């Protein structure tokens, strides 16, 4: 809505909010990111450190599918299966542990943030972290690798 804007309130004020001394001119200072090393250097250094220069090795023809490895933490591991899977295993008299295949749910790596409830579980994944495997074995579970 153009009726809610400052231009309706600036009718009758000669400078339109841009001043009488400095006026509103075309491009004082340059166009775009002009002069980022000369007369806008303070702004670029203050808010964008690291902007200028090269760092690291360049790699031609990056295929992002090769490095596709979504990760899931331990605190969300039991959300990949139904609540019925969880409650049946908890009240199970035998030592049967459900299998959570994180690859089926769309994750490849199991990271170890958080804590697990105290009941065994078999976790299928492409990759595990050291602490994720340690906590899974702590609750009596097992880590099994898939490809």
């Amino acid at each position: 809505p153009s009726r809610l804007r400052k231009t309706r309130k600036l009718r009758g004020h000669v400078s339109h909010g841009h001043g009488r001394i400095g006026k509103h001119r075309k491009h004082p200072g340059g166009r775009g990111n002009a002069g980022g090393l000369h007369h806008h250097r303070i702004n670029f250094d203050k808010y964008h450190p690291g902007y200028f220069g090269k760092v690291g090795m360049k790699h031609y023809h990056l295929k992002r599918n090769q490095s596709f490895c979504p990760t899931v933490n331990l605190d969300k591991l039991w959300t990949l299966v139904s609540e019925q899977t969880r409650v049946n295993a908890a009240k199970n008299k035998t030592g049967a542990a459900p299998i959570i295949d994180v690859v089926r749910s769309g994750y490849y790596k199991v990271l170890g943030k958080g804590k697990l409830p105290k009941q065994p579980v078999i976790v299928k994944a492409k990759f595990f972290s050291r602490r994720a495997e340690e906590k899974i074995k702590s609750v009596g579970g097992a880590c099994v690798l898939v490809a």
């Binding site: 004082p28 775009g32 702004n43 990759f127 495997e133 074995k137 097992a142 099994v144």
Partner: protein, 210 residues
């Protein structure tokens, strides 16, 4: 000129973009035109499936999608060979065939020939001359049972094997998943240089012993 905190923005509007602007006001009309052409085509091929030929089961290429299965371009020639279908008769009875696709494994190959057998069993073949049925199909199976199938023929679904909960064995609890991954990476990294060093040590051993 930059002003306080902000993002360094690089718009790509330095190249007379206003002369090449694609508006989409004909989008609702294009959807109507496509829909009418779809309906007209389905009427043209009267009892044949409206979507088109049956497509094979195909696994998606990369490591991002190899857990997923979709529909391919056409059945390979090895699949048709063991399904007993001529590669020139297949297209006339609604089987798409891709002569440039090979079969690296027998699991996907056998899954597609089961697909062809099931389609061939579901197929109602009208006689070429309706007065004289030669080898096509009984008149009862096509009197009213022949309808135009809608959607993809036998749509491809991602099946998931359900794993029953089992007692964890003692050997499973002793498997070191992180150590196995670290050692597998190191073994593949150092396989070549270990083979060179072993060969070089063999060179030094034989020359010393001689």
């Amino acid at each position: 000129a930059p002003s306080r905190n902000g993002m360094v923005l690089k718009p790509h509007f330095h190249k007379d973009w206003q002369r090449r602007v694609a508006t989409w006001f004909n989008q609702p009309a294009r959807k109507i035109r496509r829909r009418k052409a779809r309906q007209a085509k389905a009427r043209r091929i009267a009892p044949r499936p409206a979507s088109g030929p049956i497509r094979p089961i195909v696994r998606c290429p990369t490591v991002r999608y190899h857990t997923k299965v979709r529909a391919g371009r056409g059945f390979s020639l090895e699949e048709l060979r063991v399904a007993g279908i001529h590669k020139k008769v297949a297209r006339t009875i609604g089987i798409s065939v891709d002569p440039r696709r090979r079969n690296k494994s027998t699991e996907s190959l056998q899954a597609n020939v089961q697909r062809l057998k099931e389609y061939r069993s579901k197929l109602i073949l009208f006689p070429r001359k309706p007065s004289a049925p030669k080898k096509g199909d009984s008149s009862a199976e096509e009197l009213k049972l022949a309808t135009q199938l809608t959607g993809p023929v036998m749509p491809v679904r991602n099946v998931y094997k359900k794993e029953k909960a089992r007692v964890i064995t003692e050997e499973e609890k002793n498997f070191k998943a992180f150590a196995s991954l670290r050692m597998a990476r190191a073994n593949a990294r150092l396989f070549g240089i270990r083979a060179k060093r072993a060969k070089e040590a063999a060179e030094q051993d034989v020359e010393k012993k001689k």
